Each structure stands twice: as C-alpha cells, then as structure tokens.
Amino acid sequence: DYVIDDKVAILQKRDHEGFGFVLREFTPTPAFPALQYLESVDVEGVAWRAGLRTGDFLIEVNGVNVVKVGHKQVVGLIRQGGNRLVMKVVSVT
C-alpha cells in the first residue's frame, strides 16, 4: 500500500547555518505526488531536526501551494523568508 504522511516542517536556522537540503501539465501518482521532492536531507542539519526526509515532496511553501511549480520559483520562495522557512510536506511509503 501507499502510506501518505502529511507533515508541516518549521525550519528555524541560526545565522551561521544553512537548512541542509536539496530539491529536484504535470501528472501525479502517490509515488510522485508533487513536482519538487527532496533529493538530499543532511542528517542532524536544520532540515533534518524539523523532521524532513530524503524523498519528501513539497506541497506548500510559506503559504504558497507549490504542487505544480518549477525549481526557480520554489527556491525564490525558499529564500524569501531568510533564516526561517515553513514548508508543508508529505512522505509516501
């Protein structure tokens, strides 16, 4: 079965920190539910500590649904908040 897990990730970084993660008509499937998934999730990093994971998709960023949005615009939405980032995500096993 597919077990979809809905999560909200609040990523709070100190000035000397990165968050520690990397990303990359669209057509869905539980396997790939959204456009922008996680490729790396540096363990013990800020991305890790808020409970994110390798393979986690991106559904909402800082309030904006990114289910059908490309890399450029989503990064610009990751950078807009500076030392803080709230992301709606979903794990599918």
Q: What is the CATH number of the domain that holds 14?
A: 2.30.42.10
Cα 76 from Cα 71, distance rounded (Å): 9
Residue 88: which domain range? 1-93
Cα 62 from Cα 81, distance rounded (Å): 8
H/E segment holding residue 46: helix 46-49
Cα 51 from Cα 31, distance rounded (Å): 20
Q: Is 67 exposed, middle or buried (0-12, 13-18, 19+ CB in 10 A)?
A: middle
Could you tell me how far CA 78 lies from the centroid of its own chain? 9
Q: Could you list the beta-strand ranges (E) of 30-83.
A: 60-61, 64-65
Q: Solving technique for this entry?
A: X-ray
Cα 66 from Cα 57, distance rounded (Å): 10
Q: How many domains does the chain fold into?
A: 1
- The strand pair at 60-61 and 64-65 is best described as antiparallel
Cα 83 from Cα 78, distance rounded (Å): 10
H/E segment holding residue 89: strand 84-92
